[PDB]
Each structure stands twice: as structure tokens, then as C-alpha cells.
Design a binder for this molecule. Structure first.
Ligand SMILES: OC[C@H]1O[C@@H](O)[C@H](O)[C@@H](O)[C@@H]1O
Length: 778
């Protein structure tokens, strides 16, 4: 390997150039390094993110949400997803993607739950490794993130999470451990603290666990402005990400200075307070990955062009395989015969599709079809398909009546500039619930109305419009923002009053009375940076669905929601199809699933609570979100379905749930120990219905009678998805790795096998387990 010898030839300045990301000269991505031309080491570029390459001013494939990929329960889908991402990044001049994210889904409100995989470590580990191998086999480096315990957005910049060792080793770490062992090029350390030190300054995490124990060969970068000090380079952090940015920086200006790993690091090396060996080691790790990826060849592999058609096909297939049919009463779905030829489509995401979540993972595709249009196509020319908005997101510009001083709507700022924008008062005509709508183009704005903060700008979608409970009278309103370099910032301030919502609802209801079938699209607003304030659909969408389902007895809800959501209207509907955020081909996939051209086969990767405050972290500020910047993961390993099982609570929908348009039968499982002490579980699955479909056979193991440490009531220990023609049977193998039969023994500081007679259950969801065997584990 040449990397150590090349670094040995570098000056201290040349070494320090690798350890802090600078701005992209092209002003598109997250970070750039200049390399060292005299040594044949090229530039390095990194872009977000976990569901496709995000570049300012350059579109790329917007894949379905990470949660949708995980809900396929299919490692081959993750491989395909990764190959598309890697090829797009290579084609678009990048060398790394900043993903995947693989934090556990712990908090139902967690803003970024859409951007990660599961509440279960096995599903997270399998999805992460298959995607990383796909991205890296296409030539692009990955960045497993956010190491570790970044399971919420609330106060992520300052909170410290105290997590016991067994919980870390069994729940949060497995996907990172598997990603390290699969050769992920890099890790990104988390904003939050872990067990008393910032993750990005935690030697136990980044050196002892990650390197001494797991053997990680790559480098660790910080999250954006998460580096805690210059000394962090001696604690396992190799690379500082972030600089101060008023907003956008024009092309041709210098990159703003690094805070801790630039000038300050040079000063600390030259005065002896940081060993030069630490800089050398970090540069060697980076350059070693560049070598492994072929970047140090005198003549490197030529970059590919985009394969837009193949990317569309994979995006479609993932959405078709990860959508979850939650409810389907009396074969309401698939739509067929007259029921499929007279439809009232309702909801804003039927015409402005919900393609990706909000935040750094947001991707704008070249184009995305509208579900209204793909439903119209599929229903056929003879059909009647109507459309009503149902749920307005902007409403109308707030009357000048209600604003003091008046707000100058529209143009705010000339390209480049930042500023305060507005300092004034909003007068509310009547106590009620109002959407307050902010529509920014050409930059970003931040609106503070009373205690509420609203961010608006491209990664936050076309409009930001939270429903706020406001009393009659005045409320403080301040605005500020910034323009991008090419484009002035323009900004509109609107509202949707209670009356305006009722009128839009009534118009939708009328269309539902007229059609045989009502298909209501409903969406949520999960974002990086803050958690959802509650688990309900935002706005007035509950009231909409309830009114439509009261008026039409054939109401189907299509969810474009990133995580769990409450469904108080559930019993009034006949079917609910969860498309997650389904990516650029989501509309095509949605029409195909609705008509049964594809048979739903996704399963949930997380538990949906039955009530706002009944879930694993509810009712305890020291567990969520923390107090005085401190939280403790008091549930331990009993998170997600493990918590519902421990507490004997029935969730709205359980882990592993997902219906099909066909039926399946399963035999009892047969089990044989493998040569490594794992298990090979065999189940014969028959499609006993009339349609081809896929089933996911899930294996759960009960507690060892020989272990006194915490154990889950049942643990997912393997799964295998199978495709069956109508009438067809296949004998399916479910592999159980030896590690799944073990627990983390916080005495021995090591894995220990949980021996003795244990219950093995097989079936098609955590709540539909028909097959069983006693397994004597040894
Ligand atoms: O965009 C750069 C980074 O921004 C941070 O706010 C996010 O936490 C990271 O996931 C992302 O990669």
C-alpha cells in the first residue's frame, strides 16, 4: 500500500489539507479536499445523502425513503438502490455519498426516522451492508452515520445520551459494526454526546470500540460544525466538517476557515500539544481509502454517465416492494371493476407528489409524475376520476389588515445578501387552529411567530405551513433569511384559517359523495433539525379523512408519511396503503399497487403507537428529549416492539406487519444447527390465493432460561422474503447467525451465548406467529 509512503512525503500543510472539508469550488456539494497534485493525489468531493445525490443546481435520482427501502425486507433491493446512488455520484463528479444513516428508530417523533431503517438492529444491519456494498461496488465511498445514538433531532446539538453498554451493543451498534466489517470507507460521528463525551470527541467510541475492537480501516469525519475541539484528532476524529456560512458563498471566493482542524491544529502541532503523529494517521486513513477506490492511479477509471432509465426502474421497483398495505377490508383493494372506474382523488400530494423527506437528504429529481395522473392513466379512458385538494397548504396571503407593519410580499433580497426581513405583529381574528404558511424561493428564511419557529427553503420543500393554535389578538412575528448567489430571495406569507379549511374539506366531501371510491392522499412533514411535535397527521388532514370516510363507505387512504402516524379515523376507512416517501417513480408505483399490477409486499420496520403518549420514551423528560442537556435511555433494550411486548401494549400496527392481495400458509419450522452454532430454519410457504405475491417469513427467538441479563420477550433473529405464483409452494430457508443467539454480557465485556431450551416462532409478522419449535441452544 502506497498511502503511508505518500503521507511521509507530505509537508505538515499538505497533511492538514485532508483533515477539514473546504467548500466545493463548484458550489454544489457538502465538502471538497484539494488533494496534493505533486504526489498524484486528486481532489475529493462529498455530497449528501441517504436517498440519492443532493447537489445544489443539479438534479439526480430521488430514491424512495430509506425506511421504504428497509421495509422491502430484501437485501437485493438495497443492493440495487446503492448501485444507483453510487453511479449517480460518480457521474456527477463526487467521490463519496454521506450515507447511509443507520441510527435505531427509538423515538416515534424522531424527525429523521424516514431517513433511517428500523427499530430493529438486524433489519438495520442487513439494509445498511447491502446498500454500502452496492454503492462501493459502483465506485463511490460511503459514510455510515451518525455514530452513535443520534436517535432524535430535539437538541441534538447539545444533548448527551447515557446508554448502558448492553443496549449500545445490541440495539444501536450492530448496523455500524456490520458496516465497518463490510469496509465502509468512512464514518460520520454524531452531534449528540454519548456517555459523557461528544460523539466526535469520544475516544472510547471512535478508537476503542470502532478500531481496537471492530478493526475499522477507514476514517471518521464530524457532522457539520460538530467537531468539539482541536484535540478531538487524538480521540479518533480524522476530519472536521463545516465552516461558518452567512448563507451562500459566491463562486471564486475562498473557502471560509476551518475552526479547529486548520490554523489551530497547525498551531497545536507546532507547539507540541497535539502530536504530529495524529495528523499523519488521519491523512493516511483518508489517502488509504482514496487508494482503495482507484483514485491514485496515474490514469483513473473514467466516470460513467447517468443511467436515467435504469435509475427510474430501480426507484419504481423499490417503492413497489417497500410500500406496506396496513389495512384492507373486504378486498377493497385492489381497485377493480366499477370500483376502479369511478374515483374521487383527494389530497395535495396527489398533484404535488411527496418525493423525499425534508432536510439534508432532500433530493429534487429531473421530474416526478403526479399520482392523480398515473391513477387516471391506469383507470382507463372510460373511467371518471375527479380531483379535489382537500387539504390546503398555503391558503391565501395574510391580509394586510392583520399585519403591523405591512409585510412586503414577494422579493426580499438580491442575490448574495442576508438580513433581518420583518419585525412586527400578526393579529388573529378569532381563537383557532391556523396554518401559518411560508413559501420561500431563491434562498432560506426563518419565521418566528410567538414560540413557534418555521424554516423555509429548498430542503424544507415548496411550502412550510405548520398548524398553530392561536388566540384572538396580537402575536409577535419576526422574519430573517438569506439569498443564494444566483437568485434573489422571494418570500410569501399566507394562512389557512379554520373556515378556509372547512370549505376545502366540504368541496372534497362533495366529490367523494359522487364517486364510487374515494382515494385520499395524506402526508407528513418529518424533517432534519426538529422532531415532530406530535404523531398526528399535520394540519386538518384528520378532519378531512374523517369527513370523506363518513360521506363515502369506500374510502382508501394512501399515506405519504415517513414514520408512525396516528389514525383515529382508521375504522371508517376500508384500506390504508403506506407508500412512505416513495421517490421519483412513486406515483407509478402507487397506481400499480392500487390496481394490483403489483401485489403489496412491504412489512413495517417499526411499531406504530396507538396513542400519542404510549410508547417506549413517553412521559419522562429524562428519557426524551432530555433535561439540562442530559438524557438516559431508560428503556434499555426494550425499544420498539420489544417495549410493546414487555409492557403488554397493543400498538396501532406491530413490527413486521404488512398485508397482501393473496394469502399464504406456512408449515411448522424445522431447525438444524449450523457448523458455526447458528441455526438453519426451514419453512414451507404456499400461496393459497389467486394472485402471485411475496411473503416475508420472519423468525423470532424467546429468552434463554439460562441468562439473567435483560432479554427481549422475543427477538427477530432472521428473515427471508419469497416470491410465489398463485398455488405455488417453496421451502424457504431462514438463516440465523450465531451472534443472534448471544447477548452482550456487561461483566465479561463480550458476547455470551444464551443457552437452553428457547422458543423459536415463525410467521409473517411479529403479531401473526403460527409456527413454533423448541430449540436447545448450546
Ligand atoms: O449536509 C451535511 C450534514 O448536515 C448535517 O446537518 C446532517 O446531520 C448530516 O447528516 C449531513 O450529512
Amino acid at each position: 500500500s502506497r498511502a503511508a509512503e505518500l503521507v511521509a512525503q507530505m509537508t505538515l500543510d499538505e497533511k492538514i489539507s485532508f483533515v477539514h472539508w473546504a467548500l466545493d469550488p463548484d458550489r454544489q456539494n457538502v465538502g471538497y479536499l484539494p488533494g496534493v497534485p505533486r504526489l498524484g493525489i486528486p481532489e475529493l468531493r462529498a455530497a449528501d445523502g441517504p436517498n440519492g445525490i443532493r447537489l445544489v443546481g443539479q438534479t439526480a435520482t430521488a430514491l424512495p425513503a430509506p425506511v421504504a427501502l428497509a421495509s422491502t425486507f430484501d437485501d437485493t433491493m438495497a443492493d440495487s438502490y446503492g448501485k444507483v446512488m453510487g453511479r449517480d455520484g460518480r457521474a456527477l463528479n463526487q467521490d463519496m455519498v454521506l450515507g447511509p444513516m443507520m441510527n435505531n428508530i427509538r423515538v416515534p417523533h424522531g424527525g429523521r426516522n424516514y431517513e433511517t431503517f428500523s427499530e430493529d438492529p438486524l433489519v438495520s444491519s442487513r439494509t445498511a451492508v447491502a446498500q454500502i456494498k452496492g454503492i462501493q461496488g459502483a465506485g463511490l465511498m460511503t459514510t455510515a452515520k451518525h455514530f452513535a445514538a443520534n436517535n432524535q433531532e430535539n437538541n441534538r446539538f447539545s444533548v448527551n445520551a447515557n446508554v448502558d453498554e448492553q443496549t449500545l451493543r445490541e440495539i444501536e451498534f450492530p448496523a455500524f459494526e456490520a458496516s465497518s466489517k463490510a469496509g465502509a470507507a468512512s464514518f460520520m460521528c454524531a452531534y449528540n454526546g454519548l456517555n459523557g463525551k461528544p460523539s466526535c470527541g469520544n475516544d472510547e467510541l471512535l478508537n476503542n470500540v470502532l478500531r481496537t475492537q471492530w478493526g475499522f480501516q477507514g476514517w471518521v469525519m464530524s457532522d457539520w460544525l460538530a467537531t468539539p475541539g482541536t484535540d478531538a484528532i487524538t480521540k479518533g476524529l480524522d476530519q472536521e466538517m463545516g465552516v461558518e456560512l452567512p448563507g451562500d458563498v459566491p463562486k471564486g471566493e475562498p473557502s471560509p476557515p476551518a475552526k479547529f482542524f486548520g490554523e489551530a491544529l497547525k498551531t497545536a502541532v507546532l507547539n507540541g500539544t497535539v502530536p504530529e503523529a495524529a495528523v499523519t494517521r488521519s491523512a493516511e486513513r483518508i489517502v488509504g481509502q482514496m487508494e482503495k477506490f482507484g483514485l491514485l492511479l496515474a490514469t483513473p477509471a473514467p466516470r460513467p454517465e447517468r443511467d436515467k432509465a435504469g435509475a427510474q426502474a430501480v426507484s419504481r421497483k423499490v417503492a413497489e416492494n417497500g410500500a406496506v398495505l396496513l389495512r384492507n377490508e373486504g378486498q377493497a383493494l385492489p381497485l377493480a371493476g366499477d370500483a376502479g372506474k369511478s374515483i374521487a382523488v383527494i389530497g395535495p400530494t396527489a398533484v404535488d407528489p411527496k418525493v423525499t423527506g425534508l432536510g439534508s437528504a432532500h433530493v429534487v429529481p429531473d421530474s416526478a409524475a403526479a399520482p392523480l395522473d398515473t391513477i387516471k392513466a391506469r383507470a382507463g379512458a372510460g373511467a371518471t376520476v375527479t380531483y379535489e385538494t382537500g387539504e390546503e397548504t398555503f391558503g391565501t396571503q395574510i391580509p394586510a389588515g392583520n399585519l403591523s407593519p405591512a409585510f412586503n410580499q414577494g422579493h426580499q433580497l438580491e442575490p448574495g445578501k442576508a438580513g433581518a426581513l420583518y419585525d412586527g405583529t400578526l393579529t388573529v381574528p378569532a381563537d383557532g387552529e391556523y396554518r401559518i404558511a411560508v413559501r420561500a424561493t431563491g434562498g432560506y428564511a426563518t419565521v418566528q411567530l410567538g414560540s413557534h419557529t418555521i424554516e423555509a427553503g429548498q430542503v424544507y420543500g415548496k411550502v412550510s405551513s405548520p398548524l398553530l393554535k392561536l388566540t384572538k389578538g396580537t402575536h409577535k412575528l419576526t422574519i430573517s433569511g438569506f439569498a443564494m448567489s444566483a437568485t434573489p430571495l422571494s418570500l410569501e406569507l399566507g394562512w389557512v384559517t379554520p373556515a378556509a379549511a372547512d370549505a376545502t374539506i366540504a368541496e372534497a366531501v362533495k366529490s367523494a359523495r359522487k364517486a364510487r371510491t374515494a382515494v385520499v392522499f395524506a402526508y407528513d412533514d418529518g424533517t432534519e433539525g426538529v422532531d415532530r411535535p406530535n404523531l398526528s397527521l399535520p394540519g386538518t388532514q384528520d378532519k378531512l379523512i374523517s369527513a370523506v370516510a363518513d360521506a363515502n363507505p369506500n374510502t382508501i387512504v394512501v399515506l405519504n408519511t415517513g414514520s408512525s402516524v396516528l389514525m383515529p379515523w382508521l375504522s371508517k376507512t376500508r384500506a390504508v396503503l403506506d407508500m412512505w416517501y416513495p421517490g421519483q417513480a412513486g406515483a407509478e408505483a402507487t397506481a400499480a399497487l392500487l390496481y394490483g399490477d403489483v401485489n403489496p409486499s412491504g412489512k413495517l420496520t417499526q411499531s406504530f403507537p396507538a396513542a400519542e403518549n404510549q410508547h417506549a420514551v413517553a412521559g419522562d423528560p429524562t428519557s426524551y428529549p432530555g433535561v439540562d442537556n442530559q438524557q438516559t435511555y431508560r428503556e434499555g433494550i426494550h425499544v420498539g416492539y420489544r417495549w410493546f411486548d414487555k409492557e403488554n401494549v397493543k400498538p396501532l400496527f406491530p413490527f413486521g406487519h404488512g398485508l397482501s392481495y393473496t394469502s399464504f400458509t406456512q408449515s411448522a419450522p424445522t431447525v438444524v444447527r449450523t457448523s458455526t452454532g447458528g441455526l438453519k430454519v426451514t419453512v414451507t410457504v404456499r400461496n393459497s390465493g389467486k394472485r402471485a405475491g411475496q411473503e416475508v417469513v420472519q423468525a423470532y427467538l424467546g429468552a434463554s432460561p439460562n441468562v439473567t441479563a435483560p432479554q427481549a420477550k422475543k427477538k427477530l433473529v432472521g428473515y427471508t422474503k419469497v416470491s410465489l405464483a398463485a398455488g405455488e409452494a417453496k421451502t424457504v430457508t431462514v438463516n440465523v447467525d450465531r451472534r443472534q443467539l448471544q447477548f452482550w454480557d456487561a461483566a465479561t465485556d463480550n458476547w455470551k451465548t444464551g443457552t437452553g431450551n428457547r422458543l423459536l416462532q415463525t410467521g409473517s409478522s411479529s403479531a401473526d406467529l403460527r409456527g413454533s419449535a423448541t430449540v436447545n441452544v448450546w
